[PDB]
């Protein structure tokens, strides 16, 4: 089997991407944020504290003839940005772009934090990292991909995120028309539960490529590109007037600037992130100071190849017995 669904930026800055998902019988369609950096499929629901719902579409398990309460199961997750959510668990039928999993754990939110309440466009998250990160207790649950994998034509999914435009998530096949050149595959460590790999280096604009190992994660659920302070300083040094602002929480730059590209290495291959992908607009409405899309990972503890990086590429998440990642230009 295979599945294919369109993913759409939630706003004009590509702050996140939402993908429609069918849950239950009859189908309830929710727009979920496909997140290769976490492993819980959780949703706004009829159980969510009412003051914490502000425009989201909710899953109502009582209206699904295939929903079953998973007895005694709860979940609770906290992310590095400080956001969180928690609740109970149902199993139900979940479909993505034609690919169906029965008995998928659907984690129903009783509580969500302010960042989630404030994003009316995101009805929940669909985790695509490794199932070892799943938070359901006392019995850990599997991701959608883990559940679907054996049935797929090939045990893979691909992310093709658009810049200011829709893109595609495919499950079970590689669309050879969706990229240019070849796909370069690179080794993955699953030890931290992430799609963790090692970039071979970087360049800033038309500058010389610096060969250096940068370990980090391929994370569709993080907006920005978080890299070591040395690398980030080298990038922003090329933008006149750019500075790290403690008050704003990272590098900012004059909105009148033309940003250089940023290149990262995948083996001998090179993915080029155009400069405009790195512009995240005024820090506050009407400001002429703009927020940068490349920021320091110092204090995260890991580097994160988030949407800013991934949207410059066609990305293969290969869930073969030894997982790997593939990157192609497009
Ligand atoms: C800044 C978002 N990323 C993280 O927190 C994160 C971290 C992390 C750890 C410590 C400090 C900062 C970041 C490691 S892996 C990792 N990746 C994820 O956690 C992926 N899931 C993001 C879920 C998420 C958090 N806030 C949102 C708001 C809208 C849509 C999705 C979200």
Curated annotation (Swiss-Prot):
Question: What sequence ranges are listed for the domain Peptidase A1?
Answer: 17-328
Q: What domain of life does the native source organism fall in?
A: Eukaryota
Source organism (scientific name): Cryphonectria parasitica (Chestnut blight fungus)
Q: Which cysteines are joined by disulfide bonds?
A: 255-290
User: What family does the database annotate?
Assistant: Belongs to the peptidase A1 family.
Q: What is this protein called?
A: Endothiapepsin
Which stretch of the full sequence is covered here?
Answer: 90 to 419 of 419
| Record key words, sorted | Aspartyl protease, Disulfide bond, Hydrolase, Protease, Signal, Zymogen
Q: Where is the active site?
A: 35, 199
Citing just one GO molecular function, the answer is:
aspartic-type endopeptidase activity
Enzyme Commission number, as recorded: 3.4.23.22
Its recorded reaction(s) are: Hydrolysis of proteins with specificity similar to that of pepsin A, prefers hydrophobic residues at P1 and P1', but does not cleave 14-Ala-|-Leu-15 in the B chain of insulin or Z-Glu-Tyr. Clots milk
GO biological process annotations for this chain's record? proteolysis
